[PDB]
């Protein structure tokens, strides 16, 4: 009885926080500040999820009844939550089934894509920082104004430590390992390009796909030279185009991850709302 009102308040708390999170994700450019806010909102959602998980265990073992009408509301719950109403399951089971749905959506959807977005964002921010410093490695060169001199080795090392830094940082899961079949199944449902399956000791992991940065490093290797190379403006333009093309690729990959994260919020929002309606009807 008191649990219900506590749970209903906890559920609305989760709804507002979720909406604040969605505003953070619709922003054009995710900054370090943006990631910090996203992190806070997520830890708040987990705080109320645990609070909810304990109130539902109470309702489950007490066998608080969810009346016919109230159960039918659950049919509006998102298909991802795997909540249907009524048919034949006890009050104990339904309360537990609701707690699992909240926790599973938060653990397998929210937290997962919140980490993926965080990982790829941090990498892209460091990548964009290298591109911002690109003029530092470019010099006039030839005395006619038709050439430019590129510090190929410096720029090469800069991109290679970028790769070294995120070479291991996984997209999914944030820490643990996963079976080959499941790591592939998470990658196949992501978009193939963003991530790569890699064996992290006893198990597997979906790690950041470094092909965009490997493509840039190979463009630099194909320039030759021994530290510095003189490029005519036409060749500089061609090379520079390749670099900006991979920036668009990674920008695109990041937008895809943020969309998966955004889609997860929509799932969670739909569930929490439906649960509030069901709670209010008991």
């Amino acid at each position: 009885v008191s649990s219900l009102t506590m749970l209903n308040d906890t559920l609305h708390n989760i709804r507002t926080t979720n909406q604040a999170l969605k505003k953070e994700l619709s922003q054009k450019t995710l900054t370090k500040t943006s990631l910090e806010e996203i992190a806070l909102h997520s830890s708040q959602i987990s705080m109320d999820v645990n609070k909810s998980a304990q109130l539902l265990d109470i309702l489950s073992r007490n066998e608080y009844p969810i009346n016919k009408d109230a159960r039918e509301l659950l049919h509006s719950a998102p298909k991802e939550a795997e909540l249907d109403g009524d048919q034949m399951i006890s009050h104990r089971e339904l309360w537990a089934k609701i707690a699992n749905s909240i926790n599973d959506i938060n653990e397998q959807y929210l937290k997962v894509y919140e980490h993926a977005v965080s990982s790829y964002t941090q990498m892209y921010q460091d990548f964009s920082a290298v591109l911002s410093s690109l003029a530092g490695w470019i010099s006039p060169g030839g005395n006619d104004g038709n050439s430019v001199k590129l510090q190929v080795n410096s720029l090469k090392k800069a991109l290679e430590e970028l790769k070294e830094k995120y070479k291991d940082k996984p997209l999914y899961p944030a820490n643990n390992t996963v079976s080959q079949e499941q790591a592939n199944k998470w990658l196949t449902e992501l978009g193939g390009t963003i991530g790569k399956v890699s064996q992290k000791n006893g198990g597997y992991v979906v790690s950041i796909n470094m092909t965009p940065i490997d493509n840039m490093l190979k463009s630099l290797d194909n320039l030759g030279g021994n530290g510095e190379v003189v490029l005519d403006n036409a060749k500089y333009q061609a090379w520079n185009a390749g670099f900006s093309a991979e920036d668009e690729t990674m920008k695109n990959n990041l937008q895809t991850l943020v969309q998966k994260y955004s889609n997860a919020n929509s799932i969670f929002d739909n569930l929490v709302k439906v649960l509030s309606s069901t709670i209010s009807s008991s």
Partner: nanobody
Framework: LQLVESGGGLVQPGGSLRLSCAAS????????IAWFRQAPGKEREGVSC????????SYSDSVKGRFTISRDTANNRVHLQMNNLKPEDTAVYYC?????????????????????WGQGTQVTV
């Protein structure tokens, strides 16, 4: 296709000017933009530059801290806010477009890369 500067004129030491780069049949947003200046009998030098996305700005050594470059994508313009104008800055100021570069976070002051130039506006201190 025309690059076009404005905002010049005669000011005294410690004063300020706000140069503007505008264009016809040409969007300054499509490539990096730089400001050059040339005193009457000296070599043309670079002053500052701004990247395509506007989040990156560079300034020559003899200009840092005092000047500020920004983009006005709304009206398709680039501004150069020159503050505490010391007498050395007397020169014709040009804004130029580097059409070779396509990376959006970078900008250079290399004259050879800029092939679209404005007429220039006189500044005197």
């Amino acid at each position: 296709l025309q690059l076009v500067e404005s905002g010049g004129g005669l000011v005294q030491p410690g004063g300020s000017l706000r140069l503007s780069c505008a264009a016809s049949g040409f969007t300054l947003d499509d490539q990096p933009i730089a400001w050059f200046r040339q005193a009457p009998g000296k070599e043309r030098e670079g002053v500052s530059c701004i990247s395509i996305d506007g989040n990156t700005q560079s300034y020559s050594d003899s200009v840092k801290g005092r000047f500020t470059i920004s983009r006005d994508t709304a009206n398709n313009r680039v501004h150069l806010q020159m503050n505490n104008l010391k007498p050395e800055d007397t020169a014709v100021y040009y804004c130029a477009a580097d059409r070779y570069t396509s990376v959006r976070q970078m900008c250079t002051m290399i004259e050879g890369l800029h092939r679209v130039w404005g007429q220039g506006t006189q500044v005197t201190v």
